[PDB]
Design a protein around this ligand. Structure first.
Ligand SMILES: C[C@H]1O[C@H](O[C@H]2[C@H](O)[C@@H](O)[C@H](O)O[C@@H]2CO)[C@H](O)[C@@H](O)[C@@H]1N[C@H]1C=C(CO)[C@@H](O[C@H]2O[C@H](CO)[C@@H](O[C@H]3O[C@H](C)[C@@H](N[C@H]4C=C(CO)[C@@H](O)[C@H](O)[C@H]4O)[C@H](O)[C@H]3O)[C@H](O)[C@H]2O)[C@H](O)[C@H]1O
Ligand code: BGC
Ligand code: CA
Ligand code: CL
Length: 496
């Protein structure tokens, strides 16, 4: 459950948030495959309720009504086609499994669903599954409102309603089996693993019981006996009743402290400095590297939802975002996930974005295609961070230095920092308000390397900064505090 099951040499996955199956299929063949991306985390592929107020928000996909592969991203044919085409080019697919609940208990009975399935939230009727009143935790929840009134009580958070969502009685074998059948169908289709949504709201044992029923991965692409990759969404910033460690037996867990702390350090808040990152990782109180799935921001916290707060860096703060993603992709800690978002009209009234609900780029409800521009960027308001040179080249960097140990750390005692990875890569950062000009030990063999942050190595030339490393591994790095990208990165494969 801990092994990502990516094709050898590939070390990251991209969250193609709200993308349509057809666009992902294309993206796999034209970009993800050739650019060494390990895989893609897709949005919930099962049927959800249609929320008309507000107009088709992104969160309606987290309110299931059945397990039919039928959504705004596409139908089952399109889904199967995507998985096949992506696996065929070496890019795995990971599904966002929403299994702790069904739709909002307050939703209206009817066929206002993405596939037309009938459902009656009021009576807990979900005919298309099927689920009935006795498959929910209403009777087990002890709070007056039936909702989570305190996060200090493990029972409320797991047995009661998360924001009014109907809570599934996961201790029942019937429910356990319905969910397993859904996941098994996906596994057989070719999916490599899952993101267990809202794991914190389920007992580790219930998740385990479900996982034990899962099929081995499809042998058309995976070796016989391969277990699916599992990463559970557990928001634990420390100091709360439920600990992420309670889920280590099921698979990897989302380390939310990673993005919260990094954002604060890179922004230079609360007295934090980049020089403090020397012992980044478990030294900062994070979970063991091999149990962690790390990221800078995720679909929730980039828009105020979930956890992280104001410190979280997103594509909105492009410059700082790039250095944080670069640091993450360079550091050996955890399995990295890269975010890929869409632009929305933010509108902050009282420090709160009242438009945080806005769904993906659409034409009267139907999702717009991802258009690719000549300069390799995306149109139709898809930001495509994964296509930014600075990001795509760091994904490559991670592949290249995979397995090499953290080494040759250097810092100016403030915000200028540097470290390498064995003898295959080195990265330098300047987040101070002054010039960086030093001769540092890179640990790399002598030669001329193309900086992959400012450019690329084309044939036998660099399109950006070139770094000459002496026979003794040293090199000079000159980075101005006003540089567009205040960091340089070089590796074995960018060598001329
Ligand atoms: C979003 C994450 O919430 C929780 O994290 C909390 C941490 O546990 C806690 O430590 C931290 O301090 O605070 C966090 C919350 O800010 C979960 O632990 C975490 O798993 C969540 N992230 C996951 C999980 C979900 C749920 O599947 C997704 O949440 C989004 O989607 C829901 C559903 O669409 C959305 O809620 C909308 O719908 C419900 C029904 C509305 N609730 C109203 C309706 C009724 C009647 O049914 C009333 O009873 C309710 O009281 C009333 O509020 C919501 O108003 C509406 O927004 C969430 O807002 C979305 O965030 C996440 O996407 C997923 O990543
Ligand atoms: O050593 C790790 C610690 O270093 C301190 O200087 C920082 O302020 C802490 O946030 C961090 O956890
Ligand atoms: Ca629950
Ligand atoms: Cl997540």
């Amino acid at each position: 459950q801990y092994a990502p099951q990516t094709q050898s040499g590939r070390t990251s996955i991209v969250h193609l948030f709200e993308w349509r199956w057809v666009d992902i299929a294309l993206e796999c063949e034209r970009y993800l495959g050739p650019k060494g991306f390990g895989g893609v985390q897709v949005s919930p592929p099962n049927e959800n309720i249609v929320v008309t107020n507000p107009s088709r928000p992104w969160w309606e996909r987290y309110q299931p009504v059945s397990y039919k592969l039928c959504t705004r991203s596409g139908n089952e044919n399109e889904f199967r086609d995507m998985v096949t085409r992506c696996n065929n080019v070496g890019v795995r697919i990971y599904v966002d499994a929403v299994i702790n609940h069904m739709c909002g208990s307050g939703a209206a009975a009817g066929t206002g669903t993405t596939c037309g399935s009938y459902c009656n939230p009021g009576s807990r009727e979900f005919p298309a599954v099927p689920y009935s009143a006795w498959d929910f935790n209403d009777g087990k929840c002890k709070t007056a409102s039936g909702g989570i009134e305190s996060y200090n009580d493990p029972y409320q958070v797991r047995d009661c309603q998360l924001v009014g969502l109907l809570d599934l009685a996961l201790e029942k074998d019937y429910v356990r089996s319905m969910i397993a059948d859904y996941l098994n169908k996906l596994i057989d289709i070719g999916v490599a693993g899952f993101r267990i949504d809202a794991s914190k709201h389920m007992w580790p044992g219930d998740i385990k019981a479900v996982l034990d029923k899962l099929h081995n991965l499809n042998t058309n692409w995976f070796p016989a006996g391969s277990r699916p990759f599992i990463f559970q969404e557990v928001i634990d910033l420390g100091g709360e009743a439920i600990q992420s460690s309670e889920y280590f037996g099921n698979g990897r867990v989302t380390e939310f402290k990673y993005g919260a702390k990094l954002g604060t350090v890179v922004r230079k808040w609360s007295g934090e400095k980049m020089s403090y990152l020397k012992n980044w990782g478990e030294g900062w109180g994070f979970m063991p590297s091999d149990r962690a799935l790390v990221f800078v921001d995720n679909h929730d916290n980039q828009r105020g939802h979930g956890a992280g707060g104001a410190s979280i860096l997103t594509f909105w703060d492009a410059r700082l975002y790039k250095v944080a993603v670069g640091f993450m992709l360079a550091h050996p800690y955890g399995f990295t996930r890269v975010m890929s978002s869409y632009r929305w009209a933010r509108n902050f009234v009282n420090g709160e974005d009242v438009n945080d609900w806005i769904g993906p780029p659409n034409n009267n409800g139907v999702i717009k295609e991802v258009t690719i521009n000549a300069d390799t960027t995306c149109g139709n308001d898809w930001v495509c961070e994964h296509r930014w040179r600075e990001i795509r080249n760091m994904v490559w960097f991670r592949n290249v230095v995979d397995g090499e140990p953290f080494a040759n750390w250097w810092d100016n005692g403030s915000n200028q920092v540097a470290f390498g990875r064995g003898n295959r890569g080195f990265i330098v950062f300047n987040n101070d308000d002054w010039q960086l000009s030093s001769t540092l030990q890179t640990g790399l063999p002598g030669g001329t390397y193309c900086d992959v942050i400012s450019g690329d190595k084309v044939g036998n030339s660099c399109t950006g900064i070139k770094v000459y490393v002496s026979s003794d591994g040293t090199a000079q790095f000159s980075i101005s505090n006003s540089a567009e990208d205040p960091f340089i990165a070089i590796h074995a494969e960018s060598k001329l």
